[PDB]
Ligand binder design. Structure first.
Ligand SMILES: [K+]
Ligand SMILES: [Mg+2]
Ligand SMILES: [Mg+2]
Ligand SMILES: [Mg+2]
Ligand SMILES: [Mg+2]
Ligand SMILES: [Mg+2]
Ligand SMILES: [Mg+2]
Ligand SMILES: [Mg+2]
Ligand SMILES: [Mg+2]
Ligand SMILES: [Mg+2]
Ligand SMILES: [Mg+2]
Ligand SMILES: [Mg+2]
Ligand SMILES: [Mg+2]
Ligand SMILES: [Mg+2]
Lengths: 197, 136, 172, 191
RNA sequence: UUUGCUCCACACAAUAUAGAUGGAUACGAAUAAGGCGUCCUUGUGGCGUCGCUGAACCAUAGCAGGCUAGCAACGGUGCACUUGGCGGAAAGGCCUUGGGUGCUUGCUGGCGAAUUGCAAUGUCAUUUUGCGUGGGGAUAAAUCAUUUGUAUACGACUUAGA
RNA sequence: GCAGUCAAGCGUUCAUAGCGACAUUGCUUUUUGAUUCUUCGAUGUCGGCUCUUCCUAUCAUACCGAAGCAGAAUUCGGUAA
RNA sequence: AGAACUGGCGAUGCGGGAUGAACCGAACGUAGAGUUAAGGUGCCGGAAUACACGCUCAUCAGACACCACAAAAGGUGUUAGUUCAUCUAGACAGCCGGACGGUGGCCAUGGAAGUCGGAAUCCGCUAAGGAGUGUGUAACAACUCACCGGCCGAAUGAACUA
RNA sequence: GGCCAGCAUCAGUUUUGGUGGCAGGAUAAAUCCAUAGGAAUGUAGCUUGCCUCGGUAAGUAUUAUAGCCUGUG
């Protein structure tokens, strides 16, 4: 119900996440996916690497610049799934795709915004315990993605800053919860509780 | 010097374990595990809340942290007697979980005039709370 | 074929002037309705005795309810089923509160583990194992231990909404 | 079959403390500290009486309950490593060319040098994993001894030394030259 | 440059909208574990509590929100300012200081609303551009033609020329 | 044309190092047939030259496993175009 | 390539089988509403990321008839069964002890003693030992196993089925 | 007069809810109550051995300081 929904893609079962995102985009919801390098694919890393190499060998024989483009970045892999599940050759599908942004890490605009998850796409909720799974960042690096390390560095920096922010917010929330704990034996609070608040 | 191992306390499927039905004719009532049929199936009894003695899928109920002493296979009369003796209903109504359920039911039951009153009272309380926060 | 009911079916091998009052054969059939119950009765009667539906009649069909449908029992089920290459007799054990529930579990399990469809299965016998230590299957034995307790790790709650704001937990 | 409960016991001697967070085990004993990550097995640890740790698998299949005993063995080997230690004795075997094994330093890294293996002019270098101590044993001819807390690191170092000395392009039934693990036991005697 | 160009402010015009109609409301990690509070011997520590969904939290009353009179309290919030710091992954945002001024529904009053007629999105947003009025700011190049041959089918390239 | 399964035998002994009868299961479409579906208001009919790419049932090169592998040489096999 | 009965395509659109003359469903004037068929309901894509019991992890997984392929033979992979066995009067596995005498049993052979080969398939001591399960010897000698024991203490083994 | 609509009461078709009264079955089977008989995944009691509060492990004990099963009504 937000104008823009930011999904933290960590551990999110790329195909199921893409299905959710395709339906949202076609229904008219603006979606921004962050941390695509932390997306998960069910199955062994070797299985998914072999699948990506099968994808890689497909190319237009007489001109490789015409053939299917093999994007290595995790955001672009997720985008490939999403585009394959969106009717992208039509104007409606094109508009749906403009309604979407996918990022590795969490760039400035969205690091200070709320991140949501999709429970029907979460790996811990969907996969049976013990089932092996792949990480999109590792798969992308194995198939040629060049920016795993810089993304990791910037993510560590962002996490440090966000930890400071959350420590400040937690202190302020403790103060506010203390203030609301007082005046809870007040008459106004009693009427609110009688009304369910 | 002493070994430390995190307990990771789970609620246990066991005779006497109190469960809350989330789907079916009961849909929000408490029952007790009479016994365990399979890893996914239990025979339960809800005589105090009106839940008929029935074999139910464990996926149809939520285990509660409440347990009372009950012999395995106890019939409905015994289950009701032990339930009353252990005062399961009071123990459940004291929990924040049941308190949250009742609060959401009351909020759903509010009328438009009561929502307006809630707004007014919330503003009144917010004034004092913000004043205390600024004083702090 | 569906959620099962048990029926007693009694058939006659229709009387003639030479032989009035024939021998009134009865069976217990697990079927989802009376039409299927009578069809199965005539199928097995054609397997057993020299009679067909045209030369016989159903004397009575009565639904048999579980005597104690809220008592947990262990059932020994003897079945005969057709695999892809032969016919085999099997014995299995099912814990449930009724014969119909045990038979539904039996059909589900046979379909799941041997790809045996309903048409390929004969229920030779269903009988409650009255005494523990007459249960000879471990997958039922392990539920007969004293003070049986077990947790349910990795609880997966279903979300009503597409998006969650909490990064949920699987505690139970 | 999905056995309801499967359980294994881990005896803790007096001098050992086992700190088990979610699945990160830290075993501390007289000989040092060992650490192991077991978040890939989905087991449950529980301390019973400060001398006994139970490890359990609930509703587990055959492979899961096998991994349960694997976990018990791993933690037992951790405790053994911090109490008694682990030592592997390897023999140098050769028909004609004496194998020259030494310890050398390359930017402070403690390699094991193998020279003259089957007369090779190549010099074989096996890095010494941290925590593993190399001693060339007197009173026995051509013996190297690897000692340490972690049986994993000790045995992997011994295996690297053995595999670096594999014979190529020859009938290895006749050319038995190499460095082979002759004994695997504990650093402390008869404990 | 037949008073050009640009920035700001306002006014007036067109121009459309992949589609506002209270708020995209910021830890990280794990899930066979965690969040929070508290305490200490500061830890893979003790204790208590929570989850079982956002069904939340904040906001939210007033001619689409008018004009006025007070009470209580020095709070909340808008604005133009202003102090200082932080933010480069796409920073273009976050935090903060001080004062001014407006509103405050925290509480109690007085006046207004009608006739859009029994509903009609009943017009309140943002997106570019044009033009006018005021104020600030700046005062070039490129191409052709000529020339070069490190270039060259032609284009192109690479050189030179007040 | 290529590849399996069984294993009577060969292999001094030893069925399976390497082979392997009598049988039997297949695969391939670089053989030749079978057919006649397309083309007879026309798809230029052999081979070579040239050039690119693809396949692997791998001749060589890389790393390996097995041997009736002492070495040398060789043979069988694996990943591998 | 040729017959039989029927239904079809030709001559036929429509929904489904992605696609397709023949398959499934259904046959068609122009429209509205409702319900369906076959087929489907993660997204493309209308419609349950429905419910429920199980099974499967594939370094070539599999994923709906016509239909767009796969076999014999195999696998302590995993699952469920059948039958026969051993077992608290101690099952199997694990470590250690014994593993004799008659006897180099008889014969073929240059030599063959349990063990390249044929027949005889015996007992005394016996908890127990085969005229022999293997390694080894030119033949010996010597290790080795069937067999029985010492220790631990509850389930285990074999052949099959799919 | 024409164009576009709103409501009410109806009619035809249909879709989706709330609710009442009957019938049948083993005149449902159950639950419940009463009663008789039992064993156990054996409750109280009792016996033996232990010891860090106080329980435990093995026996006996069929309702007792839990219950359960089957039959009958
Ligand atoms: K032609
Ligand atoms: Mg490249
Ligand atoms: Mg050689
Ligand atoms: Mg031509
Ligand atoms: Mg041509
Ligand atoms: Mg090959
Ligand atoms: Mg023809
Ligand atoms: Mg014709
Ligand atoms: Mg037709
Ligand atoms: Mg098709
Ligand atoms: Mg019509
Ligand atoms: Mg849809
Ligand atoms: Mg087969
Ligand atoms: Mg009507």
């Amino acid at each position: 119900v937000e104008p823009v929904v930011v999904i933290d893609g960590k551990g999110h079962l790329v195909g199921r996440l893409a299905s959710v995102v395709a339906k949202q985009l076609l229904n008219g919801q603006k979606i921004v996916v962050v941390r695509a390098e932390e997306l998960n694919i069910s199955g062994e890393f070797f299985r998914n690497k072999l699948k990506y190499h099968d994808f890689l060998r497909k190319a237009t024989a007489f001109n490789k610049t015409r053939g299917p483009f093999h994007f290595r970045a995790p955001s672009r892999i997720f985008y490939k799934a999403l585009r394959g599940m969106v009717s992208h050759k039509t104007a409606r599908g094109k508009a749906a795709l403009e309604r979407l942004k996918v990022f590795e890490g969490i760039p400035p605009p969205y690091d200070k915004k709320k991140r949501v998850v999709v429970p029907q796409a979460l790996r811990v909720l969907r996969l049976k315990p013990g089932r092996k799974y792949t990480t999109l960042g590792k798969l992308s690096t194995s198939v040629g993605w060049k920016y795993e390390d810089v993304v990791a560095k910037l993510e560590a920096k962002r996490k440090v800053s966000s930890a400071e922010y959350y420590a400040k917010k937690r202190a302020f929330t403790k103060k506010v919860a203390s203030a609301n704990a007082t005046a809870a034996e007040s008459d106004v609070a009693k009427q609110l509780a009688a009304l369910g608040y | 010097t002493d070994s430390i191992v995190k307990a990771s306390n789970w609620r246990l499927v066991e005779v006497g374990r109190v469960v809350l039905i989330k789907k079916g004719q009961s849909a929000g009532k408490l029952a007790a595990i009479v016994e365990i049929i399979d890893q996914k199936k239990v025979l339960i009894d809800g005589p105090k809340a009106g839940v008929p003695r029935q074999a139910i899928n464990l996926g149809q109920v939520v285990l509660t942290p409440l347990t009372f002493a009950l012999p395995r296979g106890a019939r409905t009369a015994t289950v009701s007697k032990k339930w009353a003796a252990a005062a399961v209903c009071e123990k459940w109504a004291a929990s924040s979980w049941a308190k949250k359920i009742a609060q959401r039911e009351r909020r759903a039951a509010l009328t438009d005039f009561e929502r307006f009153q809630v707004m007014v009272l919330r503003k009144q309380k917010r004034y004092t709370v913000k004043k205390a926060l600024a004083k702090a | 074929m569906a959620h099962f009911k048990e029926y007693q079916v009694i058939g006659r091998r229709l009387p003639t002037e030479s032989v009035p009052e024939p021998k009134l054969f009865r069976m217990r059939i697990f079927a989802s309705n009376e039409v299927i119950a009578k069809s199965r009765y005539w199928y097995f009667l054609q397997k057993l005795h020299k009679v067909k539906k045209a030369s016989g009649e159903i004397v009575s069909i009565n639904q048999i309810n579980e005597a104690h449908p809220t008592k947990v029992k262990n059932f020994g089920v003897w079945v005969r089923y057709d695999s892809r290459s032969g016919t085999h007799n099997m014995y299995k054990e099912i814990r449930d509160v009724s014969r119909v529930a045990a038979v539904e579990t039996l059909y589900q399990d046979m379909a799941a583990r041997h790809r045996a469809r309903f048409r390929s299965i004969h229920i030779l016998k269903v009988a409650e194992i009255e005494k523990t230590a007459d249960v000879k299957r471990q997958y039922v034995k392990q539920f007969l231990t004293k003070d049986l307790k077990f947790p349910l790790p990795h609880r997966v709650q279903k979300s009503t909404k597409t998006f969650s704001y909490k990064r949920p937990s699987t505690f139970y | 079959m999905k056995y309801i409960q499967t359980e294994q016991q881990i005896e803790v001697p007096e001098g050992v403390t086992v700190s088990i967070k979610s699945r990160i085990v830290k075993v501390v004993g007289p000989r040092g500290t060992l650490t192991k990550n077991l978040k890939h097995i989905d087991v449950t640890f529980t301390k019973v009486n400060n001398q006994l740790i139970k490890v359990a698998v609930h509703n587990g299949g055959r492979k899961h309950v096998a991994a349960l005993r694997t976990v018990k063995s791993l933690v037992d080997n951790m405790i053994t490593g911090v109490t008694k230690g682990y030592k592997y004795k390897m023999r140098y075997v050769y028909a004609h060319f004496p194998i020259n094994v030494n310890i050398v330093e390359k930017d402070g890294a403690k390699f094991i040098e193998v020279r003259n293996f089957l007369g090779d002019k190549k010099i074989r270098n096996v890095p010494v994993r941290d925590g593993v101590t190399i001693e060339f044993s007197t009173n026995v001819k051509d013996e190297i001894v690897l000692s340490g807390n972690s049986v994993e690191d000790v045995s992997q170092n011994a295996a690297d030394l053995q595999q670096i000395c594999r014979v190529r392009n020859k009938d290895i039934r006749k050319f038995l030259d190499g460095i082979y693990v002759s004994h695997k036991g504990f650093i402390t005697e008869d404990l």
